[PDB]
Amino acid sequence: PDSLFFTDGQRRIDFILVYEDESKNEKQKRKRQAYESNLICHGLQLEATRSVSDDKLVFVKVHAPWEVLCYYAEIMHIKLPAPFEKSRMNDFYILDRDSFFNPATRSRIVYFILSRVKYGINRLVSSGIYKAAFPLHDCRFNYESEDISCPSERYLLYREWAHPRSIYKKQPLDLIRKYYGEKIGIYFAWLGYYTQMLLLAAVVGVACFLYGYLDQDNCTWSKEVCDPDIGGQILMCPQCDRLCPFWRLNITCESSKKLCIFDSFGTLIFAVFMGVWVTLFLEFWKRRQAELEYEWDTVELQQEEQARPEYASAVFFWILLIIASVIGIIVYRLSVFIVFSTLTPQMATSITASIISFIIIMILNTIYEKVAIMITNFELPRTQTDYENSLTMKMFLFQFVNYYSSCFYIAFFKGKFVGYPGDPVYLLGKYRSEECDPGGCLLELTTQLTIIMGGKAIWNNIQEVLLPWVMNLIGRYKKITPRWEQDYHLQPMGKLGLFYEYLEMIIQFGFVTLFVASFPLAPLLALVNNILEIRVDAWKLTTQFRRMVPEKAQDIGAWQPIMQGIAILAVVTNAMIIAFTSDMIPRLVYYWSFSIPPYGDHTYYTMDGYINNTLSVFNITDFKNTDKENPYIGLGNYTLCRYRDFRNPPGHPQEYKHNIYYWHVIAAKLAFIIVMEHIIYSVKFFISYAIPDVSKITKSKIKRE
Amino acid sequence: FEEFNGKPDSLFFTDGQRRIDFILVYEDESKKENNKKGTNEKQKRKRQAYESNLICHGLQLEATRSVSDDKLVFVKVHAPWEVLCYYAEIMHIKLPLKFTAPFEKSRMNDFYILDRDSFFNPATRSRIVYFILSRVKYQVMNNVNKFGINRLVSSGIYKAAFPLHDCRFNYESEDISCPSERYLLYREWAHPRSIYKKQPLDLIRKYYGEKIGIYFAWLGYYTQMLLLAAVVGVACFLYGYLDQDNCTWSKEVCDPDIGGQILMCPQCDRLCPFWRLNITCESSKKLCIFDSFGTLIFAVFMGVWVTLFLEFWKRRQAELEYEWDTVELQQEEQARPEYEAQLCASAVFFWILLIIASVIGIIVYRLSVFIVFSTTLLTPQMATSITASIISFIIIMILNTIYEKVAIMITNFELPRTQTDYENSLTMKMFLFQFVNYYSSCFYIAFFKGKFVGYPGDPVYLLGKYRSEECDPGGCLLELTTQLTIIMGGKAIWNNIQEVLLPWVMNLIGRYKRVSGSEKITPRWEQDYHLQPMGKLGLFYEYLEMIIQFGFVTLFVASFPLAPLLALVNNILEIRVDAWKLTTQFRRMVPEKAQDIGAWQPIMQGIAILAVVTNAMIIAFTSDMIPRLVYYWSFSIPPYGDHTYYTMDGYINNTLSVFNITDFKNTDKENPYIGLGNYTLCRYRDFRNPPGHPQEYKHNIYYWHVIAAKLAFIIVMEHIIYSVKFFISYAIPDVSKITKSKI
Numbered sequence A: 001p002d003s004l005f006f007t008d009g010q011r012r013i014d015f016i017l018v019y020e021d022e023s024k025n026e027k028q029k030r031k032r033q034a035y036e037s038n039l040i041c042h043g044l045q046l047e048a049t050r051s052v053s054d055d056k057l058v059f060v061k062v063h064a065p066w067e068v069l070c071y072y073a074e075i076m077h078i079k080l081p082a083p084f085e086k087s088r089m090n091d092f093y094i095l096d097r098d099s100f101f102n103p104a105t106r107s108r109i110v111y112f113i114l115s116r117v118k119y120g121i122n123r124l125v126s127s128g129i130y131k132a133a134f135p136l137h138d139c140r141f142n143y144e145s146e147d148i149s150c151p152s153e154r155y156l157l158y159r160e161w162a163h164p165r166s167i168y169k170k171q172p173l174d175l176i177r178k179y180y181g182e183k184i185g186i187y188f189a190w191l192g193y194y195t196q197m198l199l200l201a202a203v204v205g206v207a208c209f210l211y212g213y214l215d216q217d218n219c220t221w222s223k224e225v226c227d228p229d230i231g232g233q234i235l236m237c238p239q240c241d242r243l244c245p246f247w248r249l250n251i252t253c254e255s256s257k258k259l260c261i262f263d264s265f266g267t268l269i270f271a272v273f274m275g276v277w278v279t280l281f282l283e284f285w286k287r288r289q290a291e292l293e294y295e296w297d298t299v300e301l302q303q304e305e306q307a308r309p310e311y312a313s314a315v316f317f318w319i320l321l322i323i324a325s326v327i328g329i330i331v332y333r334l335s336v337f338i339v340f341s342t343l344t345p346q347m348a349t350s351i352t353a354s355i356i357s358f359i360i361i362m363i364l365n366t367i368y369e370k371v372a373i374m375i376t377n378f379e380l381p382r383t384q385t386d387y388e389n390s391l392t393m394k395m396f397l398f399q400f401v402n403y404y405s406s407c408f409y410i411a412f413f414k415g416k417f418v419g420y421p422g423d424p425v426y427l428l429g430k431y432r433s434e435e436c437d438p439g440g441c442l443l444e445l446t447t448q449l450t451i452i453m454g455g456k457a458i459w460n461n462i463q464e465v466l467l468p469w470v471m472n473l474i475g476r477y478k479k480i481t482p483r484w485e486q487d488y489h490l491q492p493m494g495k496l497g498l499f500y501e502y503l504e505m506i507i508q509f510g511f512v513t514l515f516v517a518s519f520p521l522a523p524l525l526a527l528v529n530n531i532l533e534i535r536v537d538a539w540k541l542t543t544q545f546r547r548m549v550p551e552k553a554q555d556i557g558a559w560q561p562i563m564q565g566i567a568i569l570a571v572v573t574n575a576m577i578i579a580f581t582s583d584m585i586p587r588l589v590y591y592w593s594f595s596i597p598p599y600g601d602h603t604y605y606t607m608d609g610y611i612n613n614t615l616s617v618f619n620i621t622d623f624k625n626t627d628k629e630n631p632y633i634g635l636g637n638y639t640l641c642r643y644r645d646f647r648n649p650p651g652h653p654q655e656y657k658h659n660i661y662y663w664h665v666i667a668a669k670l671a672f673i674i675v676m677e678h679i680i681y682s683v684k685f686f687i688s689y690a691i692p693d694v695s696k697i698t699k700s701k702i703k704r705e
Numbered sequence B: 001f002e003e004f005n006g007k008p009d010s011l012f013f014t015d016g017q018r019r020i021d022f023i024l025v026y027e028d029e030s031k032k033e034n035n036k037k038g039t040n041e042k043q044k045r046k047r048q049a050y051e052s053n054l055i056c057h058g059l060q061l062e063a064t065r066s067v068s069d070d071k072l073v074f075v076k077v078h079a080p081w082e083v084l085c086y087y088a089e090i091m092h093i094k095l096p097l098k099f100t101a102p103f104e105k106s107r108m109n110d111f112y113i114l115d116r117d118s119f120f121n122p123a124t125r126s127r128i129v130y131f132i133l134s135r136v137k138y139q140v141m142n143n144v145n146k147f148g149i150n151r152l153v154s155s156g157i158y159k160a161a162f163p164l165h166d167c168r169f170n171y172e173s174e175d176i177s178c179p180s181e182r183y184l185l186y187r188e189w190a191h192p193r194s195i196y197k198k199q200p201l202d203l204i205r206k207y208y209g210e211k212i213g214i215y216f217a218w219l220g221y222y223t224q225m226l227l228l229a230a231v232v233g234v235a236c237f238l239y240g241y242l243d244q245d246n247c248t249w250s251k252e253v254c255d256p257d258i259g260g261q262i263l264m265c266p267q268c269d270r271l272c273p274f275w276r277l278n279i280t281c282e283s284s285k286k287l288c289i290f291d292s293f294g295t296l297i298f299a300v301f302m303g304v305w306v307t308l309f310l311e312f313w314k315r316r317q318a319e320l321e322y323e324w325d326t327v328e329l330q331q332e333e334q335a336r337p338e339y340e341a342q343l344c345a346s347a348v349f350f351w352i353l354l355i356i357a358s359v360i361g362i363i364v365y366r367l368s369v370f371i372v373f374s375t376t377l378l379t380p381q382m383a384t385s386i387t388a389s390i391i392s393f394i395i396i397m398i399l400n401t402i403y404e405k406v407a408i409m410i411t412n413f414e415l416p417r418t419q420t421d422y423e424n425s426l427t428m429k430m431f432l433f434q435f436v437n438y439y440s441s442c443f444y445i446a447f448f449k450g451k452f453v454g455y456p457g458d459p460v461y462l463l464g465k466y467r468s469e470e471c472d473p474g475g476c477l478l479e480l481t482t483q484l485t486i487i488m489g490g491k492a493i494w495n496n497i498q499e500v501l502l503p504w505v506m507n508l509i510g511r512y513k514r515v516s517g518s519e520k521i522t523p524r525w526e527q528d529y530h531l532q533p534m535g536k537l538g539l540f541y542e543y544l545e546m547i548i549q550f551g552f553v554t555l556f557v558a559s560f561p562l563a564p565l566l567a568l569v570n571n572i573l574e575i576r577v578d579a580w581k582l583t584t585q586f587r588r589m590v591p592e593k594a595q596d597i598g599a600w601q602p603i604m605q606g607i608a609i610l611a612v613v614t615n616a617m618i619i620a621f622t623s624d625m626i627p628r629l630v631y632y633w634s635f636s637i638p639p640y641g642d643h644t645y646y647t648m649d650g651y652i653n654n655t656l657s658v659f660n661i662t663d664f665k666n667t668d669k670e671n672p673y674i675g676l677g678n679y680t681l682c683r684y685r686d687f688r689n690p691p692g693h694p695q696e697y698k699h700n701i702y703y704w705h706v707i708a709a710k711l712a713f714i715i716v717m718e719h720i721i722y723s724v725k726f727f728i729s730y731a732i733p734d735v736s737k738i739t740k741s742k743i
Ligand SMILES: *[C@@H]1O[C@H](CO)[C@@H](O)[C@H](O)[C@H]1NC(C)=O
Pocket: A228, A229, A231, A232, A233, A248, A250, A251
């Protein structure tokens, strides 16, 4: 029959208690008998039926008297499924007296009852007193419930919103909350809204990328780099000790042509726009949260305190943060070194280096999870909410360092403080500092970013869910037991599933927002990943996991401080990326200052001769001040080689010292940082302050009273 | 009604059992009516109607004729038992218990009730009576209800309406039962003889209500924090003062063999000759005093101090709201639209006017300097700077009143929904106007003086014949300090003088307008009617002046370490100045309640945020510390210098640029220099390449080195300061432990 009510009875179930008989020592059987007797004496129904599939396992089912449900609903501030009170029974309109109450709310009430009972229930399950304890789903998602009376909410919800065939359809948040709970509803609403404006972000990013694409022909510096008469004649200095000869500059046409796309004014405009996009996202999210708070039953007060089975060292945690950053940096460096120590070839080398780094990061993720779990366990938090808050902070910090250490190293600490060939810098001793090509390391940063984002999202989602679905696709293209048994055969989501999904989404948000200057197409990947992830989460939650008790919440949780922190960090990170990682500022300075007779020779501002007039000159006879073993010995009759640094030429009164152009460029970079930082923060403050005159609709809705 | 019995200080009715609450004053028809008689009879009819509704609502009233002027009639008021209790219930007035509840007639026995008249203090009784008089209606026309005591005075129906003081401030009440709180307040709080005693905020709150007690508590806390800042700033200034023989650059300037031999280059076009650098020895010494590392340390400490001040003010505010058990009435909030009343164009117009206000500020400073300098032909330069600052300050004070009037006009043109909206709009507009008016000259000196003037060969003219002004080799920091100190001192002095005098002189005119030889005893109400009305705005101007003072203290503390000391002295005087003026020369304000100071708190937070950037900019650009450090660390060394080790020797000569007189291009005024014909080259304050050279007069590597150092300093200092402020704000729990325990 697979009925939802009591067998041959008119009564609705809200939990199943399952145990293993001690008869295959009697201590466990006696303890369970005492616990069950206490539970029965407290005033709850019970019934035990043997499972046909397994004789050892015997399941126990419960019920819910109407009087107890009403009394406990009136116990705390609960509105219609305005505190409830039996003295005001007829005040609320009723369609039916025996089934009107939402089954989700009934399940939550009985969950509270079980939590308060002691012999306990949670510890009994943990220690093996009960094998499991869970509520029941409405029906099988495969087909409509046999019981015609049942609404079959699971089937309708699955077909409408969980199956991929409804990928394009809108999110039915009302059924989601009325079935699962407020936590799932708010999570999915936030995800949908996030995708909603990621659409606009992706459109703007695509516009900027296309604008960069249509300007390949006019990208003068790349053309000069390619022209053999200009690029080929320039002979660059060696970049390493033993595994590099003098190399012509024009070997980088592909690199320069690809870099000119991601190093144009379009990226600057996109970063500036994202600066205000972040604050618009925040402010509209507060508007939407207020609207949901008004429309939903989210004005119910929270318990003063809560129970937990479990009732300085902060420095030790920070030392682990430093070690995590260091180990990430060496992981990336070693990967690139080993791959290099053997059109497409160099690009493929970078791709495989990034792939290896991403793999190492993926393995390190599990170790970071485990160490965070033990370290937070050692603290013995007094309550639960603080436990989730501590997990959020510590896990977010570990993931942040583990996933952004390599990106930050590439953006800032690669080629920034390498001395001239005469006196190279060995920071740690016998460990030379890496230096980028004349264009810069922005393209490498973009490659690392895209590889990490793709790999993470794709591998995670695919490997975790798509297996049965891909099997079904392959098949298409190329006895019965009651509900409790089937539900038991499922697996539970634990207690951190929503936490893990939020962690994924926050790492995704950090990737899309922090380093947006390097990769303007990141929001498009964000949009695709979220469009898939929403349905992936819905399908997995409604198919492969046991039903979870609903909970009450008004905000996403502890992640909003991380949102604001990420925004304030992203503005400065983008400013520094544009200033230092990109070479836009030096070329603008050259255009406006070093193409005029005092320094240049052209009759008007132009980009001509930027490559020739910017590269420095080095003399081999001054190979080192120490006059020790050298790589420049022999290797042809070359006399002068050029390097990517702003320094005076040989023979100058200030030999191999930073020249006027260096300081002009540094001043321009710092001025850009200051102006962009100040303007962006001023605009963000103004936009936030413009709430009353822009989004007054929901505030008026609240003021309806 | 009935006439005066004869007891002057009696605050009761003639019977002696009913406590007066308000005095209503109206002009009787006994006057020789002129103009329109219909207006007079309508006025009378409205008066009887209002009195009829007031008595119907349950207020006992009686009148009396003034002893001297038969044309004035005073109408008393009283709040009987049931109405008092009922309205206390309606407004949720909290009363002493002995978990917490307002006062309701259902729970009379649950409160510490000793006597009806004693259970409700006179301030609360007057507040209740004011609410009754405001809510009560008198007459209706055109299907619209018209009500409010304010409307009657606005239309001239009533001359005034006010509570009464306990007794004369300087004399004890003749009534033995009278507490005479005014006497104690005058002896202990006002009357500066108690210049040092900690003011009793509890009695102030009891007498004048929360609205005044909160302001005075804020002022006291401000004064204490100012004491801390003043001590630290004095320490920094003293450290700068005691280290003078080590200020090498000023010694070089004063040395006749270095500063004397440097023939500087004329600043103006032709009205000033060449000059030698040694004539600024005194200015160099003063700058050594006011431009040391102590100034930087104090700027950092003040960046910390503003945050500590704000956080501890939040803690004190929490403690005070709990202590004065104002939570219930704070929650009880109702808004009534203004009874006087019955598009971004106005906003943009106001913004334009603000821009012009700044423009006149700059022009006034520049013109004062111009005239003082033109009149030419302790130190004459110091005297000239002081004079220019004096005229600029005078014009600023003149413009202050005009700006107030225009702000009132602008806010009146708009129709604020209620009194609170009007107050907030006026606060914002007045603050912007005063900010611009007072700080325009200071910002000009700091940032736009001697900053974008080219080399002497090609001077920069803004639009023709308006040559940009330039500073001396030391800089304009001393000029900015002089302007700031003059403005601050003059503002404080004039405000205190006007505050002390104007009510007093107006009261004296009021008294002398009664030359009739009374020389007798008069009742409380008649003599209290002669006091000034203390117009509806209230403490708005006091808060405004204190906020402008806060702006002066914080924004420009990188140039004047002694500003907190001036502020401390001013506030130490202002406590008693305000107390005396409120207790001696004004009618009793109607008590009311407020959560905090009000709309000024956002202003203070914004000023605190802006102070960091303003101070960083001042130290980076207005001062010359950054060039000094750059020379010490990177140009006294053999790559560019000749000294073996880092030193500041030779900074003056190696930094000053060179210019050849004959290289003056342009055919206009071909005799700027050749008239004197003394030498062939001059020195000027700018970093440019010397004559000859591939880039003859273009900015050199030193210029860009210095600019990069300045920008890096700005970035580093601002980021560090803001992060530190965020960390302090996070660490502070925002509430005291004891208050958290009680709540
Ligand atoms: C670069 O320039 C050299 C010298 O002109 C040349 O022969 C080569 O074909 C050019 N292109 C590449 C990819 O090396």
